Amino acid sequence: GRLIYTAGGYFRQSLSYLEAYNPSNGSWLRLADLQVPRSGLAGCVVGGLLYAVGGRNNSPDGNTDSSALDCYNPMTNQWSPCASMSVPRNRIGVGVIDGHIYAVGGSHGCIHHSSVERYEPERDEWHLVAPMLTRRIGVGVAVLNRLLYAVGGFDGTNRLNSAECYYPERNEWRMITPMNTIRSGAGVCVLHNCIYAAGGYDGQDQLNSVERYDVETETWTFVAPMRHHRSALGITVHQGKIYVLGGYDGHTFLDSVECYDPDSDTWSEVTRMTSGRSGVGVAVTMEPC
């Protein structure tokens, strides 16, 4: 697409912001608020529509985990409700395969989900699939070669360096090589043939380290670290580069947006969000009207 969309997030309370960043010219646009404030959600794009999935409304009025799926049409600049998931999923991960959205893990109160469900836009309907082998909240999710990966997170008792892979034609989950680092609330994405895991929380510290999984060799290798330690960051890929957005560094809710160039193995700061925040959902699609 053309723009990096950031939805929701958290600073003092859950937020309703939708804003879109244009890497070509450095500009930010403020777009139509989410109907319901939510942090800990995930964003993804199917057929040019942007989707916001799950999360939680942390508010003075109270705290409500979200089963919601909402859809934003850049042409109209309007949000519409879509079918809700079977269960609320705060701190969810999502991935898209063959036009279908997979919702993975997340929490509902003290329940840490291993369950997974799949949305079909053509029918506006969700169906459960096989659960992960591990309960995971704050899980990173990415798709590569039409396989779905769940990376890290928190199972209820321990933060995790473990990861696993879902094979749709077999409806089966299998463990892959674990990361070299425990990461909960990291940013996970795909670039070229590798699954990237940036930042997160290892139980004691927010991380600036980044590592990547080569599906051919099944090994994790560290690359250059981010300039800022971050957990609960947003992440996405745009024209061959990874962008990380916001997060919490142990002291400040970050407005920093960093960009990773894999040919030079360097990060640089490319812009700042209009306000520091963590727990955003991020995806890339066309510019609005």
Ligand SMILES: O=C(O)c1cnn(-c2ccccc2)c1C1CC1
């Ligand atoms: O502390 C954890 O283990 C954990 C689990 N999920 N998330 C999270 C993930 C996304 C958004 C907000 C929070 C966290 C904290 C960010 C570290």
